[PDB]
Amino acid sequence: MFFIKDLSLNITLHPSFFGPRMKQYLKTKLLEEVEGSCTGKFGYILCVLDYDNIDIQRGRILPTDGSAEFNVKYRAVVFKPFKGEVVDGTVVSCSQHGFEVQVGPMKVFVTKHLMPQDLTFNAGSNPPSYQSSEDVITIKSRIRVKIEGCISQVSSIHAIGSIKEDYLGAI
Amino acid sequence: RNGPNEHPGAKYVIRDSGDRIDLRYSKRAGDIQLQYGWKVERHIMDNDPVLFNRQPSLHKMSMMAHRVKVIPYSTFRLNLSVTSPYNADFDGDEMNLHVPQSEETRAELSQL
Amino acid sequence: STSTFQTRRRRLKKVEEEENAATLQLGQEFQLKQINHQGEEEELIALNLSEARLVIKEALVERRRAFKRSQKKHKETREKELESIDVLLEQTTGGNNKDLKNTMQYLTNFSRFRDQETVGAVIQLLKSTGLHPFEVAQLGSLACDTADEAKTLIPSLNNKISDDELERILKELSNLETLY
Amino acid sequence: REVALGKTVRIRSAGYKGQLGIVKDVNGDKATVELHSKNKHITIDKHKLTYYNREGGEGITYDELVNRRGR
Amino acid sequence: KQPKEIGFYSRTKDEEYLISDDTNLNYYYLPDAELDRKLDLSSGFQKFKDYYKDFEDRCSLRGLLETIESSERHKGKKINADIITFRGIARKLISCAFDSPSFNTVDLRIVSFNGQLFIKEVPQDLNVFTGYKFETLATLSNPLQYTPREVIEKRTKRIVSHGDEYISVVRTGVGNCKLILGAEVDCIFDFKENGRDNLKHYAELKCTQQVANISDTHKFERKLFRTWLQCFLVGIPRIIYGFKDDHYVLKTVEEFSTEEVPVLLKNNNPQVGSACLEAIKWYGLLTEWLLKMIPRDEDPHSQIRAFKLVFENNHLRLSEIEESDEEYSGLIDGEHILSNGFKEWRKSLK
Amino acid sequence: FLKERLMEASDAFRVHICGICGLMTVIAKLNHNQFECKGCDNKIDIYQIHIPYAAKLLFQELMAMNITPRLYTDRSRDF
Amino acid sequence: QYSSAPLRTVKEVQFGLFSPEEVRAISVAKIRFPETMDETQTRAKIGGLNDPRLGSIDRNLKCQTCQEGMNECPGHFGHIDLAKPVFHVGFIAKIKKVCECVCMHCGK
Amino acid sequence: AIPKDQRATTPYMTKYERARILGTRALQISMNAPVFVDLEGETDPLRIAMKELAEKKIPLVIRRYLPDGSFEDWSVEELIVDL
Amino acid sequence: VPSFFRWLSRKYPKIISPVLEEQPQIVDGVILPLDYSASNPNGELDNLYLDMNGIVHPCSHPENKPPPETEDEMLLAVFEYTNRVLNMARPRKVLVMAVDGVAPRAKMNQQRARRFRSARDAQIENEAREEIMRQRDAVRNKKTWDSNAITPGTPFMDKLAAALRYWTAFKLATDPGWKNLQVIISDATVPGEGEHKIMNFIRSQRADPEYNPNTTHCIYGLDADLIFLGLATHEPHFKILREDVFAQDNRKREEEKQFLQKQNSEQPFLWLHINVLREYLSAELWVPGLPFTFDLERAIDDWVFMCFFCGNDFLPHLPCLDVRENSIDILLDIWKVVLPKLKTYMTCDGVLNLPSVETLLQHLGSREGDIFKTRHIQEARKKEEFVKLFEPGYHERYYTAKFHVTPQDIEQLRKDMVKCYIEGVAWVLMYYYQGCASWNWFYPYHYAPLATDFHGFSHLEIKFEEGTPFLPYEQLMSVLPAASGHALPKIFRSLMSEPDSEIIDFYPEEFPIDMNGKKMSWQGIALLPFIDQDRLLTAVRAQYPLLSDAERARNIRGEPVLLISNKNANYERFSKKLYSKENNNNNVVVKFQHFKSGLSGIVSKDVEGFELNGKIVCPIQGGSLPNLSTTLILKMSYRLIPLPSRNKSIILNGFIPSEPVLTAYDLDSIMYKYNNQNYSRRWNFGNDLKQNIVPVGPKGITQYKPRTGGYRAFFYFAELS
RNA sequence: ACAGAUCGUGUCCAUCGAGAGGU
Ligand SMILES: [Mg+2]
Ligand SMILES: [Mg+2]
Ligand SMILES: [Mg+2]
Ligand SMILES: [Zn+2]
Ligand SMILES: [Zn+2]
């Protein structure tokens, strides 16, 4: 599921910083920029590998001011929740709406209408969960969950999960 | 500190992110310290390259860049040898003056 | 921020062929035969759960070593693993780096292969088939017991692989994941 | 709330001695005073020019601070 | 190793050497408004009250012996550490590496009655008064929350006196040998914990002149080197320093940290960082040399030997003083050290 | 100098144009730092351009004339 | 004002006609009432020629659609659902020519 | 599309290029960019730019665009100034 | 828009900051829960001392859509409002909710007046409705419950207290982000007006030896005095959250209805950070060449005292000080000009300096005539208490019209009024600064003296007594007006249903509102007779014995209840201390400080009846709320640690100063009285709401800003240059 | 619970035709 793509970034540098350290300045700019990003097209950017031959091209100077625009070339590991993909995670939160999963850095929700009516909200047990037959599921337990689709392309990225599928739950 | 009253003065002071300051209504001049990166709208001083134009503008010689010299009378004064390219006389002619607003335009007007 | 220029009338295509699907139909950005920065006609790289963890770990230690050498020139099991990448992340990436902790924890908890030789030979074993690297990554990461689990897990392998070969390399992967 | 606002004044000393004008704007120690005969505006120290009455009478110095009135 | 608190001892005036109380503790309190204000640190120069060596010979370890005896009585067995030294004295021992012997002259006597090392202490005004004044307005008797406002107002113009000395005994192990050191506490910047380790709650303060050029900057760097060596010897979180000028007016108060000081010190000049490394290595080398040839006898009844250590010709000259010398008679035979109770406790351990 | 006279010394406007439609009908909310194009439900490619207000008025009038003056920030060539 | 959208320069302009679906898609309101300010000449009529969603009318208040004032709001386009199709005045000649070119009973 | 051994453009520096370089350097100096030459007490950014151009100490590259779309990069220090 | 809000906006700009509230999204009929553990875009927040009385009232009987349900709708509304504000603020250390309960006799009389009125207007509106159906059965009246029903001692207070505990238990059980959050609930049994308990708790927490000076606290409330209350406690990193009213969009007059619904569902909120306002005060109270030392800490308390003197909810406003928007500046400049004449300050931790107050009031009376003349001129110009002779200042006419007494009586009455007014000023200062001075002080007058009075108060001393808090039943009797028989004991109803001598005098049937005292709103004065102490106390104590034991059980003072989660750091220690010992007595009390987690205080075994391994029933029985167990929460009593000494207003050591978000230009603008008149540019406050972030949270390890020196200061200067 | 007189910054009077002019 993990992919590495040759992404591109455009940055603007003030001419007051036009010193011999422009290369390292752009390096740290990119480093703090793409780390932890939540872009809706590529997905989740986790690590920026290949910290060599970044190949910072010449910076075209805008006619308006002295700033220069740079087009840096880099590769990084991406993370996108492709719809219809089976993934395995851990339970973190479980309200009456459903039990969430911790597949990667996301908050995929398994809403009550997705999995069958077998799962019941039993609040008597100390950890609030959906204790039922066909194996035991609880908080911080192994669970395999499918992805129905992608929502909220802007801001945070997450999806919705379902368990109603043969050889998908329990495990 | 001179203010917008004498010729060698300023009219506006621009701080970061706009926020224009007026030097004729605020009167707070003198007790204001100019930090680096600000902009000051000073008056047009001597040796300032400006664009001097006469209409109709047929050829490129109708547009010229001159050097500002402040004079104590309310009229435009020019050398007698530049009237021929302008095709202008002094029987009541009217001519326009344009000033640059950036280093790019000032330098390109001076050098071109 | 993009890597592919407009083509096939991207301005007003007006097709809207959904957004994603389980039976291939990958996104436009993640399409086969990607364009490399200097090269061209390079297929998309797919990483398994174990491969991605090794990649990020090796990148992190390389960056830490580079930073340490720059400073010098200027001048158990799962429990032990958590301390290692904790102390690696606490000084290499810097910043908030809140999102990185969860990804690394999930990679360590759900890691299938922990031996360099085994993960290296995984690609050699899987290169026999001409399957799309995404589904081979899915079968390498997700566990299985026989052909039924692999067939039911994803809908992209309908009659694309012979059952005998499918069960053969499924048992091969089963032993290659149970040996470590 | 400056007292020297809209009051008939006479300029003393300098090159405009004896001129009659009305204060228009005050900018700190400097104030803008128009002129009756001359069609121009001049700026001088507010403490210098004397102050007269709108209708007409005796003239006084800048001591009008203690008496917020005309004359 | 990580320093561990052993106990707390108080040495008030008149040589009373009280044990196990916090009557000589101070708390830091200095609002930024006071720093902004033009405080004077030279008023009332005639109000100085001195209870130091001039009043009586403070060069003794009777209080330290009493407090370690009390700690051993409370706990039992024998402390594994082999060298006892005052916090101030130990700093001067290693300061001779980069300081001339004339500037740093140290006279000490050792005792090996316990099969260990027992260091005995052996013996301008305006600057001292200004430092004491800065300490007085930089400290509070009781905690601020329990301090009335009128007490603060009186303190802002209080007299200058010497006292309220807080001594803490800390066992610090460096290398393969364990050492016990008697630290000095001046103020408590943060909160105070009762019946718990307060090493992280301690602090250290001093005064220095304002810099004008790079020479004064280098002098301040050397002072920071000395105080960082001090802190590394004891373990102190706060190294707050005061700044004074020609007019003796407080200007700036800083908040240096133990970990931050070496990094900035090395970043400024590589030479001082190399000196730091050389000093921290030389301290261990000197300790390992001291624990090498000194005759240690665990038998209490064994004959005690007295030594004198003088740093001459870049070497530590150690020689055993003859028993017929009057110094030994006035030290051991005269019962200057090794009190009757301490000797009784030592014999009980046998 | 021509550009400065036409823009800085005269009308100067900033508008947001959708990267798919090419029109200026983009809903921009600077308070929440988000943009949206209701025409093609686009939210991840919005560009800002600096054009004179007269040009914006002319484009709006042309759009009122059932004519679409789509503006693009990239050159269309080859494939 | 600061906008996170990247700043670019126009490189080409593509002309064309406006499809009947596109105008409805981009329209923010539907105009049906031909009278404006019908609320006792105090406020603006909803759905009229001066709909608030069309844009701000005075600087102090903001535009409901995008929440800026006049100096920043570029305005928004509405639409009118014509009862019957109407010939374009500027395309009458082109319509006649293309009708002559093609058959009047079949598209061939 | 950046040939070097096949650069057929003139090695000299045009008046428009000179004006643009001087203006850009002057604007950068005015907005507090680092200066690589001593000023001799000068205080006008434009004359500082001319002084820098005199000894060829301007770190800029001229990109001359061919009509088809290709281009070649010429350094400021390698361009002969004769006008 | 309220005058106070715009006044503080124009006098102190760049203070109001918008809330970056996250908008939940619903897709495919599924609403994604909000991530509580996510970082708050509005800055880090630790404490959320909140007033529940200011949130329950707006939900009940609003200007539109009244709640038809008796209690279910109100409980749902308060629950959703609490959830919204908690998500908006996102606390991380401690959340405290307070409910108004027993108050001092002063607030007592005031509330009496207020409610009695509310009852009168409710009677007017319901009789108007009755005649409305007359001119058209009894089911169409739609008579909602009166606002007087919200009073401690009523069963509604018990229902609210029960609902809050269940709500917080459900939130703690269902939210993984509440692992390290402590919830303190103060029901109506505990005396206080909602904010007094808050400041008492803040002062008690500040007295802890391990208290962190860098803790950030936020208070939610629509009251107009809590802004000055936050400055009175001298606690930096203080932010005030309130609903925005500057917009004031059009109310209700398809897709239009849905847009209007979402507009109401997204009401914005504004920040009122005072850390950046502290700089505003510091650049305002400076005095040129003052004799004694000057510090910001002593200046803010004096300003708070002056603001309280302008107008307080306890004492009536002065006749000269009625606008409370412009006279504040007048008295501020009077204090500034008279400060050099004094060799000391004005207030010292609540202690009032008599000569300073005497000089201030003498100067105010000297300036009183000019202010009265200017206000008369303004009123006459606007036009172009029955008798007012403006030439002599109508002092005698005012006395004879507000008291109807003879000259000797007016002299003795002015003396008594001065005495009681200075005593009340001292009492309100003492209450708002440190604890409560007295629970029995009252003002036996309906007005306040003016002019050249107050000059004879110098030869006096202030001395109060602790007293005892009032019981819920006597307070309910004192505050509740006539009728309003709901939520009342049967004994009180029987006492009402008989023509008693004290019933008619203390609680008549018609409130004379002829005293409008120069105003044009519900605002008025209390013409109701001042209820005495002995008669009401004897009546209540005589009616007590025959009350049922079950009803009499609701007469305990009570204690705040702690509801720490099951994953708290101190949870194991508390369980071991209070359950392993199984002492079965109220003697095991712990003294954990603020070093571990937070919430320094003393706890004790719960007296409500909480048990381990049990279950908690839903109090409202509506909405199908899940039934949780006691294995995830702990209900235990909490007690405030008594203050060892007076709450001295001294900044705690180690406090990190706030970075200046403010330039020196506006500093000198306020200092020199530049005003916005010189700034002819349109100062759009709406545009002033866009470009403000106001970072909150300590900046830098060092607690001292650079003030030259050497080493680090020299390096900083070189970097700046 | 809480629950405001204006204050403080304030933007201009436009369009269409007709005539007389001057370089
Ligand atoms: Mg002519
Ligand atoms: Mg000291
Ligand atoms: Mg109140
Ligand atoms: Zn679009
Ligand atoms: Zn708009």
**Domain locations in chain H?**
1-83
Q: Which helix (H) or strand (E) holds E348?
A: helix E340-349
Cα atoms in the 13 Å half-sphere on the side-chain side of I179: 7
The whole domain housing A33 covers 1-84
> What does the block give as tokens for I508?
């008549």
Q: Tell me if C148 sits within 8 A of A162, measured CB to CB.
A: no
Contact yes or no, B with D (3+ CB pairs under 8 Å): yes
Could you count the other beta carbons within 10 Å of the beta carbon of residue I270?
Answer: 19
Fold of B1-44: Dna Ligase; domain 1 (3.30.1490)
- Best mutation site among I670, I675, I678 for testing chain B: the one with the most B CBs within 10 Å? I678
The whole domain housing C135 covers 47-71+77-180
Q: Which residues of chain B (59-98) touch nucleic strand J at CB < 7 A?
A: 88-89, 91-94
Q: Which residues of chain I (165-194) touch nucleic strand J at CB < 7 A?
A: 193-194
Q: Which residues of chain I (107-126) touch nucleic strand J at CB < 7 A?
A: 107, 111, 114-115
Residue I11, CA distances (Å) to A5, C9, I95, I670, I674 in order: 55, 58, 32, 9, 12
Q: Tell me if E237 sits within 8 A of E202, measured CB to CB.
A: yes
I74 has which bridge partners?
none
Nearest to C139 by CA among C70, C46, C18: C46
Q: Tell me if E339 sits within 8 A of E332, measured CB to CB.
A: no
Angle at alpha carbon of residue I256, lines to I255 and I260, rounded to 5°: 115
What residues 624-653 of chain I have any CB closer than 8 A to a CB of chain E?
A: 644-646, 648, 650-653
Distance I227 CA to J3 C1' (A): 16
Distance B94 CA to J20 C1' (A): 20
> What does the block give as tokens for B11?
């009219």
The DSSP annotation for I267-306 comes to: --EEEE-SHHHHHHHHTTS--TT-SS---HHHHHHHHHHH
Which phi and psi angles does I185 have, rounded to 5°?
A: -115, 125
**Burial track B79-97 (b if 16+ CB lie within 10 A, e otherwise):** eeeeeeebebeeeeeeeee
> Are A73 and A144 in a shared domain?
no
Report CA(C4)–ligand 4 centroid distance (Å). Answer: 19
Tell me the count of A-F CB pairs closer than 8 A.
11
> Are A94 and A162 in a shared domain?
yes
How many structural domains compose chain A? 2
> Is A58 at the interface with chain H, CB within 8 A?
yes
Interface residues of D toward B, Cβ cutoff 8 Å, are: 27-28, 30, 43
Nearest to E51 by CA among E111, E10, E11, E7: E11
Which residue of B36, B103, B112 is in closest CB contact with H26? B103
We report the CATH number of the domain holding residue C95 as 1.20.1250.40
Contacting residues for H73 by C-beta, under 8 A, at least 6 apart: A58, H2, H61, H62, H63, H64
What is the pairing mode between strands I636-639 and I561-562? Answer: antiparallel
Q: Using CA of residue I401, residue I405, residue I406, residue I412, what is the dihedral sign?
A: negative
Q: Which residue has the tokens 């992404």?
A: A7
Q: Which helix (H) or strand (E) holds H54?
A: helix H45-54
| Nearest protein residue to nucleotide J23, judged by CA and C1' positions | B93
Q: What is the 3-state secondary structure (H, E, C) of G62-88?
A: CCCCCCCCCCCCCCCCCECCCCCCCCC
> What does the block give as tokens for I124?
């007017």
CA B59 to chain centre: 24
The DSSP annotation for chain C comes to: --SS---SS-SS------S--SSS---SSS-SSB--SS--SBPPPEE-HHHHHHHHHHHHHHHHHHHHHHHHHH--THHHHHHHHHHHHTTTT-S--HHHHHHHHHHHHT-----HHHHHHHHHHHTTS---HHHHHHHHHS--SSHHHHHHH-SS-SSSS-HHHHHHHHHHHHHHHH--
> What does the block give as tokens for F7?
């823009």
- Beta strand ranges found along H15-75 (DSSP E): 61-65, 71-75
- Beta strand ranges found along A31-163 (DSSP E): 44-45, 60-61, 68-73, 76-79, 86-94, 98-101, 109-111, 142-151, 158-162
Cα atoms in the 13 Å half-sphere on the side-chain side of I300: 25
A154 contacts on F by Cβ (under 8 Å) = 34, 43-44
Which phi and psi angles does E182 have, rounded to 5°?
A: -95, 100
> Are A73 and A7 in a shared domain?
yes
- Domain range H1-83, CATH class: alpha beta
Could you count the other beta carbons within 10 Å of the beta carbon of residue F45?
Answer: 16
Judge: domain B45-112, CATH 2.40.40.20. yes
> Are C7 and C60 in a shared domain?
no
> Are A22 and A90 in a shared domain?
no
> Are C36 and C92 in a shared domain?
no
Q: What nucleotide is nearest B25 when CA is compared to C1'? A: J9
I668 contacts on B by Cβ (under 8 Å) = 28, 31-32
How far, in Å, CA of I393 to CA of I371, rounded? 11
E109 has which bridge partners?
E120, E308
Contacting residues for E115 by C-beta, under 8 A, at least 6 apart: E82, E296, E297, E298, E299
> Are C27 and C89 in a shared domain?
no
Q: Tell me if I324 sits within 8 A of I310, measured CB to CB.
A: yes
Report CA(I113)–ligand 3 centroid distance (Å). Answer: 14
Name the H helices within chain B.
83-86, 103-111
How far, in Å, CA of E2 to CA of A99, rounded? 46
Contacting residues for E82 by C-beta, under 8 A, at least 6 apart: E115, E116, E117, E177, E178, E179, E291, E296
Q: Classify I167 in phi/psi space as left (phi over 0), alpha (psi -120 to 50) or beta.
A: alpha
Name the H helices within I480-561.
490-496, 501-506, 534-543, 549-552
Last residue of a domain, one of A30, A55, A84: A84
Last residue of a domain, one of A58, A84, A110: A84
Q: Tell me if B58 sits within 8 A of B92, measured CB to CB.
A: no
Distance I137 CA to J20 C1' (A): 83
Residue E29, CA distances (Å) to E34, E134, E188, E239, I4 in order: 10, 12, 9, 15, 38
**Burial track E287-322 (b if 16+ CB lie within 10 A, e otherwise):** beebbeebeeeeebeeebbbbbbebeeeeeeeeeee
Q: Which residues lie near ion ligand 5 (Cβ < 5 Å)?
A: G 63, 65-66, 73
Which residue of A93, A121, A156 is in closest CB contact with I176? A93
Q: What is the DSSP letter of I709?
A: -
What residues 49-78 of chain F have any CB closer than 8 A to a CB of chain I?
A: none
> Are C174 and C106 in a shared domain?
yes
- Best mutation site among E29, E30, E145, E261 for testing chain I: the one with the most I CBs within 10 Å? E145
Q: Tell me if E167 sits within 8 A of E184, measured CB to CB.
A: yes
> Are A108 and A80 in a shared domain?
no
Q: Using CA of residue A142, residue A143, residue A144, residue A145, what is the dihedral sign?
A: negative
B28 contacts on I by Cβ (under 8 Å) = 668-669, 672, 674, 678
> Are A95 and A164 in a shared domain?
yes
H61 contacts on A by Cβ (under 8 Å) = 58
Q: Tell me if I167 sits within 8 A of I132, measured CB to CB.
A: no
Return the biggest CA–CA distance within chain A. 70
> Are C2 and C85 in a shared domain?
no
How far, in Å, CA of E83 to CA of H61, rounded? 70
The whole domain housing G53 covers 2-85
Q: What is the DSSP letter of A79?
A: E
Residue I259, CA distances (Å) to C82, G31, G67, I268, I577 in order: 50, 17, 14, 16, 56
> Are C162 and C91 in a shared domain?
yes
Residue ranges matching CATH 2.40.40.20 in chain B:
45-112
Terminus-to-terminus CA distance in chain E, angstroms?
29
Contact yes or no, E with A (3+ CB pairs under 8 Å): no
* F9–B102 C-beta distance less than 8 A: no
* F43–A154 C-beta distance less than 8 A: yes
How far, in Å, CA of I119 to CA of I115, rounded? 6
Which phi and psi angles does D50 have, rounded to 5°?
A: -80, 170
Could you count the other beta carbons within 10 Å of the beta carbon of residue I260?
Answer: 16
**Burial track I619-637 (b if 16+ CB lie within 10 A, e otherwise):** bbeeeeeeebbbbbbbbbb
Name the H helices within chain A.
22-34
We report the CATH number of the domain holding residue G69 as 4.10.860.120
How far, in Å, CA of C172 to CA of D24, rounded? 98
> Is A149 at the interface with chain C, CB within 8 A?
yes
The DSSP annotation for F28-59 comes to: EETTTTEEEBTTTTB-S-EEEEEE-HHHHHHH
Contacting residues for E307 by C-beta, under 8 A, at least 6 apart: E109, E110, E294, E318, E319, E320, E321
